[PDB]
Design a protein around this ligand. Structure first.
Ligand code: CA
Ligand code: CA
Ligand code: CA
Ligand code: CA
Lengths: 440, 440, 440
């Protein structure tokens, strides 16, 4: 009963990019994916995306749930939708035609668009909006969509404009296109021509007006791309605020569309949350914090730090200026202070690494203490090695732990030491020279 | 002659918080405290705050200057103000009734509110404002405050709305409430009912209209809380700019309400100043700088750094990426470079710690030089120790100074050394091994 | 044929600064320089800047291309322009009179201003604009410029105001001033008085209206200075976006007026680019990145780092939290990780310094590897020294390389070592003590 056609064929030269226009991201995902998500709201029985230049590229990612069709020749929107003929020809119902570059339209508006369509038995309904600066846009007279050039000194005053989003009765849509194309006397034909045909035939043409004009934004250049990110950012942050998350400045906090955040979390300005990130209850995120594809538990405090593809338990304190790199896990109540880098290591609960430390490829136990300046070495030039540090070990400041090596439970390393051999449990490893003063 | 009643009883379920609503902060202090500060402007002979859930909590901080009264049962604003009867009953004068959730109202407006009250001998004056979207708010007809539901197809057009802030003649206020409550035929009664009673009795009811509608904002959820921080931020930064402080972007700089800043200071965007912080003349604060409960002198340059509960003299340069922790003091012209952490230490003038260094619990003299990579160790596992470093000492790069220990004036430590014993004045301490090459 | 007079004499007491008002910067250069750049658009045969207090200071920088004249006495704008008499007296043509504190006016508007001037043969044309809050500004009746005080209950309604920018026929301009000054019966005389004289004489006085009122902004205090930076920031970022640069938030990115950025560059919010900075194609700049007077190549990724007066080749990755200091050069595909400081050193291609490292005054070859914690020492107290590190050298973690010293190609340093003597090619230098365990 409901069908959807997504127009996603290049031609976006104002973007000054080699990437297909619809692949440019907005709050974490491509414009095309935001459009697929809105389209899902109408629960279309079938969906077809017309692609073009770098066709496979657009398919080489956001594929699967959707049928694709390629157009090797660009002859306008009419032609583009004509390329979906092989799949929608004959079926009865309602067909939504939408551009892959209008990422701000919501599922709720698409739905209101169809409802209106049916509630008036229209043959075609134009999604429209009102602006005080109609310049350029096609004007809505419903009788006909007058273009800017073909507009009369009078018509150039119509506030209501065409958003380029439509709903047509599937049977008549392909008919009109088939017709226009042959008796067009021109090469390229636009989808708005079909609106012209229903005018001739006296068929019913409705128009749904959007409440918010800004949701109709079509992205043609990077100025409109930034505007899209601005609206999407406000939308995302608004939902988080209604859900109990505090923002010092929601106009300057950057949270991707799929990030999950528990109520009571507090977010200072200029925090960045990307990908599949998740934040537990009562966690505090301070200015400069940057988190990507990670999980942060409840009661944590992340201070001006960078966390990537890692997991952080409840009550962890990180920062300021720490870097938690891929595949690290920080156990409950762990503390990572300033200028510490943790990479590919698991760290047991209550362990502390408060300063200028590098921990890579280690399995670390609980209640371990890393003195300021501790460095793990697990790279020789071609191969890496792992290090095991037991529970309750004390690693003196400015030490160098050279892997492969193991430190047993409760062992201790003296400051300034260089460890090259296993240190047994309860032992004490020292590898530093003796001090020698010299008067005058 | 002037009395004030502050309504601060829970019921804020849209906040999704376990903290009493009025305790949520805006620019450094609770909404309740911003309201107390505005209220002080009318110089009320007596002030009473009606609290409720977590009553003690609200008292367990912002107490002292104000009388509190608890309401174990929530039966509306009428009931809430009725709880202050034991204290304001009988007194003559003017009584301001204000919610603890309207933190943007200024003392100047409260004052204009009273003046208006007296200048018209009103019995009650409603603080009002005009908006183009009156939906939801009580409409002002002065005759009566028509609610959204009880509003006629006509009345729902009144632009002027009720802010919920009022001034009543104290004697008649408690009378009407006492009355309504008994012949109410209902449990809960609203303070706006008193406006209804004065209508019956034909008493004079005025209305003061605020010039700025946004100052009337009542905070019910975290979206309005962010709006309150946005307005308060602009207000605070505006005053600093009029006072000679330059801001690269005052819409994105976060300065708490009590921070003091001398004229000629320059502030880049995204700087955060909290608590009792004070900044001296001509100081430059760059992007990312975060200062809490600290004092910074004149002529300093703080570059992307974090400073907490410390004192910084004139001409100090800090950063980028340095962390000055609690109870540290940096003398005149001291320089702390990148990746340096200073914790609980005093540092004499002209001393320099330019790179990757950790200085904790030390008393440091003047003209000292910390080579890159120097680490102080004053933690054994259960106990801490102090270190004294005299004037003009040179601490070679990558050294480890293990406390307790002392370095005498003009002494010197060789790079890569580990110091465990006192180093006498003018001496030279070395604790590093010898280098051994190996051909091929 | 075209002449220009720039009014830049102090009197800006609301700025609370000891610097001449026009010297305050906006997006990297003084307000005066933005005005010179707009003025150049009219291609003036001669340009004269009237200075005053700290006269030399204004000349001690933005000099050269312009004639200066000092006024030791402040008797108004009429007097100020009278000081340029010695140079413009007698010449025929058109003379633009503009204040050094209106940095937002564009060259395109100045040009439209002259065109209008000539297209109407006016004797004088007032650059005007319309605002809904004319309060304070001089009203435009063209007949006369009525001031706020001398305005009639009616005139105080004129929406069109005087921007203080004018074009006069050079011959008549000095005539009227010469006249007014003698029969003024007052000390100070304003340039708007000349508009009064042409009214008496019945001469033609036109007015060009600006499309954007905000471009007329005169900066008198730091609140308007921030507004100027806000408009200039939007203008600069807009041009970059039209040119192919992506901005996550162009309202919070700080790019100086002369920074050059190649298309396809991606810029996260809160990035700062200053001075003569240049960014190559497809480079990614993340939140917190701060670049000053540097060149970054194509395909680089700068993550939250500070780069000053340096050069960075193609494919370099820097950050997070690295500091590249003055006079450093990073070769192609070099990698500088977190907490690394590079100062005055050249670094060959593919070299890697991934953690907690300080590299100063070194010449480093290609394919070198700096293990975490490596420190170069080239400071003794009064003198500095250089270090040469050949190609393919491996510098073990936590080492100390003490200059002057040299490491030959393919040599290697063992971790925890202190190097004080040259290390020959293919050799292996070790300077660490031996580890000694201790049971229980
Ligand atoms: Ca274990
Ligand atoms: Ca001393
Ligand atoms: Ca070579
Ligand atoms: Ca070290």
């Amino acid at each position: 009963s409901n069908f959807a056609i997504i127009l996603a064929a290049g031609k976006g030269t104002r973007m000054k990019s080699d990437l297909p226009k619809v692949l440019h991201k907005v709050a974490g995902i491509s414009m095309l994916e935001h459009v697929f998500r809105s389209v899902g709201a109408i629960q279309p029985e079938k969906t077809v995306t017309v692609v073009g230049h770098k066709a496979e590229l657009v398919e080489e990612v956001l594929a699967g749930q959707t049928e694709f069709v390629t157009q090797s020749e660009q002859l306008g929107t009419g032609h583009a939708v004509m390329m979906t003929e092989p799949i929608l020809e004959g079926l009865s119902g309602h067909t939504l035609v939408i551009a892959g570059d209008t990422p701000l339209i919501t599922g709720e508006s698409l739905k209101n668009l169809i409802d209106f369509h049916i509630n008036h038995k229209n043959v075609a309904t134009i999604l429209t909006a009102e602006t005080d600066n109609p310049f350029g846009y096609g004007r809505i007279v419903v009788l006909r969509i007058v273009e800017q050039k073909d507009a009369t000194d009078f018509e150039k005053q119509i506030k209501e404009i065409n958003t380029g989003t439509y709903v047509f009765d599937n049977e008549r849509l392909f008919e009109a296109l088939k017709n226009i194309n042959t008796n067009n006397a021109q090469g390229e034909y636009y989808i708005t021509d079909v609106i012209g045909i229903f005018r001739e035939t006296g068929e019913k043409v409705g128009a749904y007006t959007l409440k918010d004009f800004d949701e109709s934004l079509g992205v043609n250049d990077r100025v409109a791309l930034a505007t899209a990110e601005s609206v999407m950012r406000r939308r995302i942050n608004h939902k988080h605020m209604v859900n109990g998350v505090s923002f010092v400045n929601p106009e300057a906090t950057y949270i991707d569309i799929d990030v999950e955040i528990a109520p009571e979390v507090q977010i200072e300005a200029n925090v960045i949350l990307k990908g599949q990130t998740k934040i537990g209850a009562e966690t505090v995120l301070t200015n400069g914090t940057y988190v990507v594809d990670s999980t942060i538990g409840a009661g944590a405090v992340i201070t001006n730090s960078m966390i990537e593809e890692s997991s952080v338990a409840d009550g962890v304190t990180v920062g300021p200026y720490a870097h938690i790199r891929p595949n690290s896990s920080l156990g409950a109540q762990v503390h990572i202070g300033n200028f510490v880098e943790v990479k590919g290591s698991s760290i047991g609960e209550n362990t502390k690494a408060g300063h200028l430390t590098y921990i890579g490829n280690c399995e670390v136990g609980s209640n371990v203490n890393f003195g300021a300046g501790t460095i793990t070495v697990n790279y020789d030039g071609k191969n890496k090695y792992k290090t095991v540090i037991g529970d309750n070990v004390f690693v003196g400041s400015n030490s160098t732990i050279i892997a492969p090596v193991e430190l047993g439970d409760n062992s201790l390393v003296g400051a300034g030491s260089t460890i090259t051999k296993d240190v047994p449990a309860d032992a004490i490893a020292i590898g530093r020279g003796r001090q020698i003063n010299k008067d005058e």
